[PDB]
Design a protein around this ligand. Sequence first.
Ligand SMILES: CC1=C(/C=C/C(C)=C/C=C/C(C)=C\C(=O)O)C(C)(C)CCC1
Ligand SMILES: CC1=C(/C=C/C(C)=C/C=C/C(C)=C\C(=O)O)C(C)(C)CCC1
Lengths: 161, 161
Amino acid sequence: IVTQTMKGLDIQKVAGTWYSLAMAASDISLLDAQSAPLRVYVEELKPTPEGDLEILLQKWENGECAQKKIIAEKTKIPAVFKIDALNENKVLVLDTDYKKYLLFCMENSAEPEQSLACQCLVRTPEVDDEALEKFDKALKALPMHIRLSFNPTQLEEQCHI
Amino acid sequence: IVTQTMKGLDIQKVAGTWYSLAMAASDISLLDAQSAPLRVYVEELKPTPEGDLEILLQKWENGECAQKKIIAEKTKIPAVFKIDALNENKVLVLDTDYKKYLLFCMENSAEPEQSLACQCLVRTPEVDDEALEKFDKALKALPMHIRLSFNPTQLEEQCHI
Ligand SMILES: CC1=C(/C=C/C(C)=C/C=C/C(C)=C\C(=O)O)C(C)(C)CCC1
Ligand SMILES: CC1=C(/C=C/C(C)=C/C=C/C(C)=C\C(=O)O)C(C)(C)CCC1
């Protein structure tokens, strides 16, 4: 569904702290509630020597903000990883400069229209218009129906409260 | 995929304590590890007045056994519920006597061959052959490739260690 991947990515380079500045889903319900399925906040990204992608993220669950740790296994394509689970789910890195922003999407494979959410990761808790634009441009073709945006205050808060 | 549902079920009646005596999946990887995707242990089932199905279960995660709480929303069919999440996943109650055992399956809808696990819930931490048989019979048509069985000792242990 996602027809953008960035060429010649250096996954080890996207290691560190990230701020989920914004997010978008193809179905309102994927992000609607606080406990909505794909409403996750990225704490940090750590690539493993083997070239896999460990993701740290907060997630509102059962009444309170819960930390979570995920492993996305590399595949033959550098910018595409698969996180270990049910129904099959692929992570795609669309574009990044390693030091400012990162656009990446997650889709459940088959005919994922009933599965796709993208985020705009930034390094600092500032609103980066330049980044927001590339996000908005990237999603332009994408069949998104919900879009969230967070402010610096919220970004320095657990689960962006 | 699952062509067995039990007629005239009384969901309020399946409330209480349950022991996951055994489990089966259509893909070895759904149950292979300790951290395998569908390797969940049922603590108890609580139906809500509205007719929904709250499931309590343990799950080995990130190195230790974690408690988890799930809500399966009723649908027009009494024995079929949908738990609130990504990729779409349906819970089916195949057969039960409320007081001894419960057979129920979980499948991700579409062409779920890459999605189906069933369990044999019992009320006591004893091995119930009668129950095991109905489980084994029910699964007979089902394309299962992994099957686990737990002993009383394990059943009185968190995450069946
Ligand atoms: C949607 C989405 C992402 C995936 C989140 C996932 C797949 C989290 C895993 C959660 C776990 C294992 C369980 C749970 O939430 O209960 C990532 C950050 C990759 C990219 C931005 C969009
Ligand atoms: C497979 C399976 C079941 C489903 C388990 C589910 C769907 C658990 C939810 C887990 C959560 C929300 C997240 C996680 O594991 O990270 C039930 C007990 C219905 C019936 C027996 C087979």
